[PDB]
Structure 1
Amino acid sequence: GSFVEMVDNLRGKSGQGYYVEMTVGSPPQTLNILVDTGSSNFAVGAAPHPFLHRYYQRQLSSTYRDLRKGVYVPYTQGKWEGELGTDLVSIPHGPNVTVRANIAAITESDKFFINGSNWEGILGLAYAEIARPDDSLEPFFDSLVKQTHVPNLFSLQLCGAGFPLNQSEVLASVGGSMIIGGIDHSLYTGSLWYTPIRREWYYEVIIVRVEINGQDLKMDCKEYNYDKSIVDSGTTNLRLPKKVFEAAVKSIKAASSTEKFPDGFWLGEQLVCWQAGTTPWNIFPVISLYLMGEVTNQSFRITILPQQYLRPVEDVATSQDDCYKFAISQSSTGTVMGAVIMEGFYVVFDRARKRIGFAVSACHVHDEFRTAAVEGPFVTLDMEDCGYN
């Protein structure tokens, strides 16, 4: 209920990724670690790199254990290679515990690290099934639960700002919260609705209906989870399977036709700008994703605003202009509910009850006329059929 100690322990409000402070080794070596529910490897920079301000020095840790085994990890975006080992890890603004975890010491990387992001590592919070080299490499959260009395669940509140933040601002501002082992009521309003984790590999879920300003996209629901649907705090966008992406874009285009934007905008490649303060939020439609409920034949829906899917970007010419990039994009590997989705809600990864809860986030961005939402229940049927095999 109240884990005040961990509240506001995240940073990256308008950066490239949300991260938490961690220390590894003995004496403790401080590092900022990206919180990623989309993968399962705990990895940290362990050699100098143009974008790293600091990195893991194994020679200086008295508790480091070298497993003498290499590891390679390719994500949808970026990839890295490293050397496996274990060491003691702590989270300054997390529970007061220390755990020996597997750690991939990154020695080579490609398009992984992000210039100015301020994080030097990644905490894969998903299950062993997708860990590399294979599922025998115990993920961090599993190590944590096994070695301590921290309950088997964590919750995340990722806070977008709605406007660009500069270097000092990102460092001096709260990026959100990761409550390890509990749920804090101060992070959301209204009810928490839970959807089952279909299978424990990624945090896979099942979407049963999609609406653009209340209008049903009306596609075979399997199309929505075609391949799979996952909740991924390590991915910026709301990514949709090709067929779904094209239908959504066509409907978003129609809802906002009073204004015309170049194709590059819809591809997420070129930003769109408006005179300062004149962003026409109201012409853009809200987007609702319906999730299977815990009760049979029951579903609920999460609704986001253009304030979630139009990400703030500082325009080249300092211009007082407010610019944004369209952050809904195409996927060939299933739906990815990234930051575009998570910044609108307080999300609970209840691993113990194999379910994920959603509640309107106390920090989501909006305007006076609309807010993000979580509502239920809805009587929908044969949603078991929505899953892909």
Structure 2
Amino acid sequence: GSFVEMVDNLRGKSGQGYYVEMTVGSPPQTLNILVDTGSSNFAVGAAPHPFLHRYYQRQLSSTYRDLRKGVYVPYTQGKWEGELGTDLVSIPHGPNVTVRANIAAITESDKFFINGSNWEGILGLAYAEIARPDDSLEPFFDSLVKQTHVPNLFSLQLCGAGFPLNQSEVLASVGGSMIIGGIDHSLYTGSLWYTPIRREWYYEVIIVRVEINGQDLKMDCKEYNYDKSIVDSGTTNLRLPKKVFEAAVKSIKAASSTEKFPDGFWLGEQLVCWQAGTTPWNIFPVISLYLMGEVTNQSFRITILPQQYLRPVEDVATSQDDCYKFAISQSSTGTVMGAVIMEGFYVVFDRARKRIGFAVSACHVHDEFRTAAVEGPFVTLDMEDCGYNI
């Protein structure tokens, strides 16, 4: 491990997000910021809200610069709106640099802030193409690389606890690491395998084959990337395109058929509970996603366990049972490799080399019989045909 200052600088969990401490303004104003590889704006609460115990106060920052422009960000299940500006930004448990970055000061929002999440803003780490209002608003990471000698790469180790964390425990627990400008070898075991970044907007990748307990899902590979496949720390679940979700759920049900679960469980709505310590991990299958490799006609696979795709939740009766929600759900916007998938792996966002690296995480949850895996190579043909085009 060569980046000790950044190791263990994250807190949080899959369902509420993983956040890093940042400071904005002069004198510095400390805020907790959601690490989001699925968006490209640095946006912070800048007005009182019921779910925020602190927010950015532009009038107290001597370095605040008003861009005199509003930003409106409506999304599926909500929105945020604010005012654009710039200020001096630092990451205390990060590179020892201060940069001038764009900041969207959030003045109004609907279903954006989460009660008890402990974060007050979001760090959009994806590319300018998807920045709001448009690609002229330089994302934070682009500013950081342009203004300093920080290498154009970051890596994420998101650590799921494997069990529920109460309010006090989640504040006192280490949620993982965001290594800015490098790869820390203490965070993974085995080898790093790289997949190309198909296009620089979201962190888009190409899935070439899917297995459930070694059994090929046998769908046309274009289905797996319809209309795109992305790596997103800002999404909780592994999200699959409708048809892929339907085929995967049927195969996961068939593999776990020794126990019957209600439809509400498979819909990701209701929890399932087992007596403390008796979760039947072994009846649930492993899921392998094969990704396009860096060499022609070569792929590799990442394999996750039910310990990643069953999300620990506290029972409604706060009982001594071990309870979970199924953390795989359908999408109408392509595949999303969310936090529950990222929790299995150390993920390297190698922007400099337009590639994403995967290695087994040193903090993934497993049992004495199975572990997550990153393996290769495999001979795979016509992988370019797996990508979707509108």
Tell me the number of residue pairs that the alignment of Structure 1 and Structure 2 aligns.
Answer: 389
Q: Deviations over 1:233-257 (max 9, x none)?
A: 0000000000000000000000111
Equivalent position SS for 1:12: strand
Q: Deviations over 1:199-252 (max 9, x none)?
A: 000000000000000000000000000010000000000000000000000000
Give runs of aligned pairs for residues 117-266 of structure 1, distance below 5 A. 117-266=117-266
The answer on whether the counterparts of 1:14 and 1:161 sit within 8 Å (CA) in structure 2 is no
Q: Deviations over 1:24-69 (max 9, x none)?
A: 0000000000000000000000011111111010000000011111
In structure 2, what is the Cα distance between the partners aligned to 1:210 and 1:222? 12
Unaligned runs of 5+ in 1: none
- Please name the residue that 1:381 is paired with: 381
The alignment's TM-score, normalised by the length of structure 1, stands at 0.99
Q: CA deviation at 1:261?
A: 0.8
Q: Deviations over 1:291-339 (max 9, x none)?
A: 0000000000000000000000001112101110000000000000001
The answer on whether the counterparts of 1:307 and 1:366 sit within 8 Å (CA) in structure 2 is yes
The answer on whether the counterparts of 1:15 and 1:117 sit within 8 Å (CA) in structure 2 is no
> 73-82 or 165-174, which moves further after superposition?
73-82
The answer on whether the counterparts of 1:13 and 1:174 sit within 8 Å (CA) in structure 2 is no
In structure 2, what is the Cα distance between the partners aligned to 1:379 and 1:252? 26
The answer on whether the counterparts of 1:15 and 1:170 sit within 8 Å (CA) in structure 2 is no
In structure 1, what is the Cα distance between the partners aligned to 2:374 and 2:126? 24
The answer on whether the counterparts of 1:14 and 1:163 sit within 8 Å (CA) in structure 2 is no
In structure 2, what is the Cα distance between the partners aligned to 1:78 and 1:294? 38
Classify 1:271/1:231 alpha carbon distance in 2 versus 1 (closer, same or farther; 3 Å): same
CA RMSD after TM alignment: 0.8
In structure 1, what is the Cα distance between the partners aligned to 2:186 and 2:79? 36
The answer on whether the counterparts of 1:193 and 1:359 sit within 8 Å (CA) in structure 2 is yes
Q: Deviations over 1:262-307 (max 9, x none)?
A: 1111010011111111110110000000000000000000000000
The answer on whether the counterparts of 2:22 and 2:32 sit within 8 Å (CA) in structure 1 is yes
The answer on whether the counterparts of 2:14 and 2:236 sit within 8 Å (CA) in structure 1 is no
Unaligned runs of 5+ in 2: none
The answer on whether the counterparts of 2:22 and 2:89 sit within 8 Å (CA) in structure 1 is yes
The answer on whether the counterparts of 2:275 and 2:322 sit within 8 Å (CA) in structure 1 is yes
The answer on whether the counterparts of 1:211 and 1:217 sit within 8 Å (CA) in structure 2 is yes
Equivalent position SS for 1:248: helix
Equivalent position SS for 1:265: helix
Classify 1:203/1:14 alpha carbon distance in 2 versus 1 (closer, same or farther; 3 Å): closer
The answer on whether the counterparts of 1:13 and 1:173 sit within 8 Å (CA) in structure 2 is no
In structure 1, what is the Cα distance between the partners aligned to 2:75 and 2:155? 23
The answer on whether the counterparts of 2:39 and 2:126 sit within 8 Å (CA) in structure 1 is yes
Equivalent position SS for 1:160: coil
The answer on whether the counterparts of 1:14 and 1:165 sit within 8 Å (CA) in structure 2 is no
Equivalent position SS for 2:308: helix
The answer on whether the counterparts of 2:82 and 2:105 sit within 8 Å (CA) in structure 1 is yes
- Please name the residue that 1:289 is paired with: 289
In structure 1, what is the Cα distance between the partners aligned to 2:304 and 2:74? 30
In structure 1, what is the Cα distance between the partners aligned to 2:14 and 2:292? 31
Q: CA deviation at 1:73?
A: 1.6
Q: CA deviation at 1:168?
A: 1.1
The answer on whether the counterparts of 2:237 and 2:328 sit within 8 Å (CA) in structure 1 is yes
The answer on whether the counterparts of 1:14 and 1:170 sit within 8 Å (CA) in structure 2 is no
Q: CA deviation at 1:388?
A: 0.4
Give runs of aligned pairs for residues 1-389 of structure 1, distance below 5 A. 2-13=2-13, 16-389=16-389
In structure 1, what is the Cα distance between the partners aligned to 2:375 and 2:330? 27
Equivalent position SS for 1:352: helix
Q: CA deviation at 1:14?
A: 6.2
Q: CA deviation at 1:151?
A: 0.2
Equivalent position SS for 2:320: coil
Q: CA deviation at 1:359?
A: 0.1
The answer on whether the counterparts of 1:343 and 1:361 sit within 8 Å (CA) in structure 2 is yes
In structure 2, what is the Cα distance between the partners aligned to 1:14 and 1:355? 24
In structure 2, what is the Cα distance between the partners aligned to 1:79 and 1:274? 37
The answer on whether the counterparts of 1:81 and 1:106 sit within 8 Å (CA) in structure 2 is yes
The answer on whether the counterparts of 2:14 and 2:340 sit within 8 Å (CA) in structure 1 is no
Classify 1:14/1:36 alpha carbon distance in 2 versus 1 (closer, same or farther; 3 Å): closer
In structure 1, what is the Cα distance between the partners aligned to 2:78 and 2:326? 21
In structure 1, what is the Cα distance between the partners aligned to 2:13 and 2:254? 31
Equivalent position SS for 1:165: coil
The answer on whether the counterparts of 2:14 and 2:339 sit within 8 Å (CA) in structure 1 is no
The answer on whether the counterparts of 1:97 and 1:148 sit within 8 Å (CA) in structure 2 is yes
Classify 1:89/1:356 alpha carbon distance in 2 versus 1 (closer, same or farther; 3 Å): same
Q: CA deviation at 1:15?
A: 5.7
In structure 2, what is the Cα distance between the partners aligned to 1:290 and 1:70? 42
In structure 2, what is the Cα distance between the partners aligned to 1:278 and 1:113? 35
Q: CA deviation at 1:356?
A: 0.2
Q: CA deviation at 1:110?
A: 1.0
Q: CA deviation at 1:103?
A: 0.4
In structure 2, what is the Cα distance between the partners aligned to 1:286 and 1:269? 22
In structure 2, what is the Cα distance between the partners aligned to 1:14 and 1:160? 7
The answer on whether the counterparts of 1:14 and 1:164 sit within 8 Å (CA) in structure 2 is no
In structure 2, what is the Cα distance between the partners aligned to 1:165 and 1:352? 36
The answer on whether the counterparts of 1:2 and 1:184 sit within 8 Å (CA) in structure 2 is yes
Percent identity over paired residues: 100
